[PDB]
Amino acid sequence: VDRGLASANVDFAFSLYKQLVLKAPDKNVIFSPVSISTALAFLSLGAHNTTLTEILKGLKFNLTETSEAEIHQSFQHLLRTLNQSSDELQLSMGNAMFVKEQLSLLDRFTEDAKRLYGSEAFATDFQDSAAAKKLINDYVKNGTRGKITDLIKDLDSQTMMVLVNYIFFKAKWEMPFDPQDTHQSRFYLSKKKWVMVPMMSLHHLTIPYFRDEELSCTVVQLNYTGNASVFFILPDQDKMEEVEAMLSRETLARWGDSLEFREIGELYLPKFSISRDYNLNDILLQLGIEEAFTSKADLSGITGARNLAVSQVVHKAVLDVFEEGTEASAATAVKITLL
């Protein structure tokens, strides 16, 4: 609901996207910006000094116009809003902390974690890494209704804490595709190469539409039942990189404001499921989040001492698009060790 939170989180989304594509320019991308934003906001709760400022600025907050306390309350309100009951769309977001029982935590930290981020503190025996890994993965599998089963691949036996966020999304199209109209068709990987995919179709449809001639792309909005929708951006053949370079809060605002209703004779959309697993360490470094990974890490808001450091931030996401609607889930984990 927060205008300043929406602006920072969208700036972060597009800055993250651009780094992911730079890292792996030939790959599908799928990730949840709000899952990663919330996980790192959760982390910043325990951060102090340069570690803290780097995280908040990396999340694209203007600290000359907002404070850490405002940010945390904004995320609290976001989680409350996202997790409201709904009869139309399924959406849930949860946070948890898995902590070695022997690790002394500030009362202020665990209280704030629960109050602001809805997070319990789960005592976890990381020295039994296989069982600790199973527990965290089960938490994510439960939260994502089975969609994400292997967020944690490896877990150091000397892990002290893991912060986890998940998002679960299941929605029906306002205008669903008839499966009888789904046919094998070409999906062109390049001008010369294609793969055969099930191509769904809708006919005689009136939807928001914008041909962006300057950017050589077409934008359409398809609605879910509920307060969610999806912006599809279709660059002309071989213009994807030109469009990616223009991705920004300003461009998305422009697109949203330029859409007009148009009767579409035929719309063709593949039925597909894609997933990606990410090690976000180099990504977050590129966005300026550095000290939290170093021996100079200041996470003294968690314990009272500068005795913890991030080892790895991971993210996994899955997107399933089909005739009835969309299912998408993601989860983010912040692994923390002793320092």
């Binding site: 959406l91 999304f169 793969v195 999806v230 719309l267 063709y268």
Partner: protein, 34 residues
């Protein structure tokens, strides 16, 4: 008549109209990619 054919790489941005959150952002370069 206008035809919109997602038969080449495209982007998806799943948005919440209530909070203006971007739930998911995607580039489909290959729906059958390994």
């Amino acid at each position: 008549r206008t035809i919109v054919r997602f038969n080449r790489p495209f982007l998806m941005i799943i948005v919440d109209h209530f909070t203006w959150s971007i739930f998911f952002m995607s580039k489909v370069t290959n729906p059958k990619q390994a």
